[PDB]
Write a protein that binds this ligand. Structure first.
Ligand SMILES: O=C(O)Cc1ccc(O)c(Cl)c1
Ligand SMILES: O=C(O)Cc1ccc(O)c(Cl)c1
Lengths: 225, 225
DNA sequence: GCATTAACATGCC
DNA sequence: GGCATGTTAATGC
DNA sequence: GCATTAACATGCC
DNA sequence: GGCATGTTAATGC
């Protein structure tokens, strides 16, 4: 029914795969440990039973960038070699379940629906990243930040009297990483939005005091203002 | 064994799915016709038996951008709604095969390997677009153009005496669309590369006269030179 | 560091 | 011959 | 239009 | 208390 993500965190979780972790291999990591080491070739799907993984790509010159965050019931779909150098670290004590190709056949023979759940999980990732490429080719950095707050507000902002609240803990550093904008530009833009009384990004909530202005500004070509 | 793409054209073709098009629905399009209309909700996988599709996303303000090109044995993995407005046009007379969820079950009951072929096709797309996001966040437009020619040369350039040839018909307009660089910047960069005798992009071949210089320049922060 | 604009020139079922 | 692709330099976001 | 740099200030298992 | 996150303005790619 719907394969969408506004942010690259907890893409299409598959809670029913917890009924089949006995067909796969349990593997616990300590906080701070590598689930996937730089240069490690992975050929398993990795189901996250409990915890939190940060998953990054590393370029040849050593540059490192965020791809996504993974939480409980997330799926790392690295069953085959891809050409990318991936580094995935446990942000907390984390339980995984490693599903090889053979082990997946065993799961599908028991439950043919899990096939389509995995397709949904992949589709969601492709829809996210393909749009993000096209969005970066269409809107300027500062506009992409406004567009993110508008879309989170539309999709998950709760009306609370005069305002909308987005119940979400989200740092400026991550906003920058997700939107591809320098963290100092992120600080500047939020300063503006705050002092103009449009939006306040707090520790655990973003509060939108003025959605129609937020939206209007997101429709311009810059908000380096 | 390998889920890679340097360019968003002909991602992981699955030639064996042509053995199962009788389980799905044949649908022929004329050149210039919409395979997916703007705003059309698609819930089928669409296998391209013969021809060529150009597949674009359209934003709310009407901006339109390339996602990818599809050729024979390519797969459009839109089995479920995604939230994106997609517009896909037949660039030539094109035969498709539409596979619903029910129809895919029928295919998998006959050949369990087709499951994993589809996973490979999805993985390849996710690896492409996820890297492209991270690359646009890491390298400047002009550098991304150099990096593309270097990687195509590495991956598919054939040594021909003094040179490498990449046997590929690729317009400046598409290079721009793929790399997210204005077509006039693309023209400028190629002018430079040509007159410095590094590389010549012709109608049906790119010729690299100097791979080590190409590579060296791709390692700098700009080539607006 | 490059997008944009503009005015112009060459390619092409 | 008409519309799509490519060219070059200047201006400032 | 914004990344970068820099020098500084506030947050935090 | 130490290292990570956030702040603000200036400079020019
Ligand atoms: O491994 C890669 O190159 C990309 C990637 C990373 C994480 C995932 O869950 C997927 Cl499906 C792909
Ligand atoms: O439909 C989308 O939002 C993205 C998309 C487009 C084409 C494909 O083949 C896939 Cl797998 C996804």
């Amino acid at each position: 029914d719907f394969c969408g993500a506004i942010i690259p965190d907890n893409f299409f979780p598959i809670e029913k795969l917890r009924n089949y972790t006995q067909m796969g291999l349990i593997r616990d990591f300590a906080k701070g440990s590598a689930v996937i080491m730089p240069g490690e070739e992975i050929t398993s799907m990795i189901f996250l039973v409990e915890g939190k993984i940060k998953l990054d790509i590393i370029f040849e010159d050593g540059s490192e960038k965020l791809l996504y965050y993974a939480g409980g019931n997330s799926l790392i779909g690295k069953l085959y070699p891809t050409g990318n150098n991936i580094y995935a670290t446990a942000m907390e004590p984390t339980r995984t379940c490693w599903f090889s190709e053979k082990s997946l056949r065993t799961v599908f023979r028991t439950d043919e629906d899990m096939i389509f759940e995995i397709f949904k999980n992949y589709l969601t990732k492709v829809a996210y990243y393909a749009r993000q490429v096209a969005e970066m080719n269409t809107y300027n950095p500062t506009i992409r930040i406004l567009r993110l707050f508008y879309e989170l507000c539309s999709s998950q902002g709760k009306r609370v009297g005069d305002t909308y609240e987005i119940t979400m803990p989200l740092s400026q550093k991550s906003i920058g990483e997700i939107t591809g904008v320098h963290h100092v530009t992120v600080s500047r833009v939020l300063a503006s939005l705050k002092r103009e009384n449009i939006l306040d990004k707090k520790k655990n909530k973003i509060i939108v005091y003025n959605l129609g202005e937020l939206k209007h500004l997101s429709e311009q070509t810059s908000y380096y203002s």
